[PDB]
Amino acid sequence: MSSSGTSITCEVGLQLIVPDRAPVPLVARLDYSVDDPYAIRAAFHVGDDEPVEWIFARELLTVGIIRETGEGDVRIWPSQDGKERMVNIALSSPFGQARFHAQVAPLSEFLHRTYELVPAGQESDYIDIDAEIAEHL
Amino acid sequence: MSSSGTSITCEVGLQLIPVPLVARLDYSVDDPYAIRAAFHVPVEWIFARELLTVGIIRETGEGDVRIWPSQDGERMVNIALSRFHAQVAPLSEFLHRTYELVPAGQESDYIDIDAEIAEHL
Amino acid sequence: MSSSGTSITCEVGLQLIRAPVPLVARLDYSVDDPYAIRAAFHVGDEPVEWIFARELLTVGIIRETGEGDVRIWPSQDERMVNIALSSRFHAQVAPLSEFLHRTYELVPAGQESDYIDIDAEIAEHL
């Protein structure tokens, strides 16, 4: 039963794949907080850029490494690069989907660490604590 | 507010960021993950109960909804569908009542009952 | 405990509610994505796939509910279910209900966690 404050962060190498253009490398900051136990925040930025932050369900990324899935405008699916296992994340927009491309190992490792803090199915405990703090604040 | 054992409803003072307005929140065990809010200037928003519980403590969001806390010296909650401003005390009390009917993590039982009803129509 | 590959599919008659236009939708559920249901259909316009929470459909057959853009609610005609994404489908409950029952037989409501744990475990060994 981890402390109410616990949180983890890492950085992951990514590529922005654009239809009629070459790939653009970029680093994404992933983080997970036990106070928001169903979520993963991801801050993407290109080169010397201030980030834009996406927030989505942790389970969507766990499932998306294994099979094509999605929620609303987010869409995640796996892929191969010969032997190398990849995961693809896309934001849907009428103005054309943009697409991220990353290797599985680092995302998997990060997710494994999040599950060590809060195992799948025990998120409730942390929701209860959040509710309890609010009920005294 | 008022509780029936099956459904709960309350009214909460809000501001559209300022213009004051009253919102009607309600929760029903037959939709155990959801909270419905109804505004006036009527329009109904429906979102995950957990999103509001988490949003009182820290910035979070789902799709177009974004919820985050703030200070007025008084603890506030901000909801912003792609900007509402309200006191935490009333929302917290309402959420506590919903958790008394259906504790976090036991929503499944009520989903099972909804499925059981449907299998016979 | 069903195996990691288990999946079910069915076809369901639908109407897009102008004049009503009949169309067939392909629903499928996979234990690897235990909270989700996929919906795929076409008119004429190449196919399009929607993905939503299983529980949203189970709840929507009983009462008005929604998540983000999706909105599901029941109605009378024969018992009907109405689904309405934004940027209106009309179907009988019997077939959806039977399909949802089959999905709960594979993965009961509340045991999705086990299948998430397997998905994590596979990734961890890739």
DSSP codes, A83-123: TEEEEEEEE--TT--EEEEEEHHHHHHHHHHHHHHS-TT-H
Burial of A86 (0-12, 13-18, 19+ CB in 10 A): middle
Nearest to A134 among B60, B63, B92 (CB): B92
- Answer for the pair A114, A8: CB distance below 8 angstroms, yes or no: yes
Contact A72 B63 (CB under 8 A): yes
- Answer for the pair A113, A34: CB distance below 8 angstroms, yes or no: no
Sheet bearing C48-53, strands edge to edge: C48-53, C36-41, C21-30, C7-16, C89-92, C79-83, C70-76, C65-67
Contact C65 B34 (CB under 8 A): yes
Please give the domain boundaries of chain A with CATH numbers for all domains: 2-137 (2.30.31.20)
Contact A131 B62 (CB under 8 A): no
Please enumerate in sequence order all residues whose Cβ is within 8 A of that of A82, keeping only pairs 6 or more positions apart, or say none.
none
Contact B114 C79 (CB under 8 A): no
The 8-class DSSP code of residue A4 comes to: T
- Answer for the pair B56, B86: CB distance below 8 angstroms, yes or no: no
- Answer for the pair C37, C51: CB distance below 8 angstroms, yes or no: yes
Chain C residues closer than 8 Å to B118 by CB: 58, 61-62, 93, 97, 100
Interface of B with A in 56-115 (CB under 8 A): 56-58, 60-63, 75, 88, 91-93, 95-96, 99, 103-105
Contact C55 B33 (CB under 8 A): yes
- Answer for the pair B26, B35: CB distance below 8 angstroms, yes or no: yes
Q: What Å resolution does this PDB entry report?
A: 2.6
Counting runs of H as helices and runs of E as strands, what totals does chain A give?
A: 3, 8
Identify the CA nearest to C28 among candidates C13, C14, C38.
C38
Contact B118 C59 (CB under 8 A): no
Instruction: List alpha helices for B1-121, DSSP H.
Output: 49-55, 88-101, 107-118
**What tokens were used for A33?**
């907080």
Buried b (16+ CB within 10 A) or exposed e, B39-74: eeeeeebbbbbbbbbbbbbebbbbbebbbbbeeeee
Nearest to B104 among A39, A55, A124 (CB): A124
Strand-pair partners of B16: B19, B84
Q: Which 3 state secondary structure label does DSSP give C4?
A: coil
Q: Which 3 state secondary structure label does DSSP give B27?
A: strand
The 8-class DSSP code of residue A2 comes to: -
What is the distance between the alpha carbons of residues B121 and C63, in angstroms, rounded to a whole number?
Answer: 14
Name the minimum distance, in Å, from the CA of A28 to any CA of chain C: 20
What is the distance between the alpha carbons of residues C79 and C86, in angstroms, rounded to a whole number?
Answer: 24
Nearest CA in chain B to C62: B114
* Interface check A55 vs C, CB under 8 A: no
**What tokens were used for C7?**
């999946």
C-alpha angle with apex A21: A19 to A24, nearest 5 degrees? 105
What are the CA-CA distances from residue A11 to residues A26, A57, A102, C24 (Å)?
Answer: 10, 18, 12, 44
Identify the CA nearest to C25 among candidates C12, C38, C8, C9.
C12
**What tokens were used for C117?**
């744990």
What is the distance between the alpha carbons of residues A35 and B99, in angstroms, rounded to a whole number?
Answer: 17
Identify the CA nearest to A90 among candidates A103, A81, A80, A78.
A78
Please enumerate in sequence order all residues whose Cβ is within 8 A of that of B69, keeping only pairs 6 or more positions apart, or say none.
B55, B56, B57, B58, B59, B75, B76, B77, B78, B88
Chain C residues closer than 8 Å to B112 by CB: 104, 108-110
- Amino acid sitting at position C32: D
Helix H, strand E, coil C: the string for C47-95 is: CEEEEEEHHHHHHHCCCCEEECCEEEEEEECCEEEEECCCCCEEEEHHH
Q: Residue A37 CB: number of other CB atoms within 10 A?
A: 22
Nearest CA in chain C to A106: C124
What is the distance between the alpha carbons of residues C7 and C4, in angstroms, rounded to a whole number?
Answer: 9
Strands A52-57 and A69-71: unpaired
**What tokens were used for B45?**
């928003």
Nearest CA in chain B to C74: B118
For C97, phi then psi, to 5°, come to -55, -50
Nearest to B30 among C59, C97, C104 (CB): C59
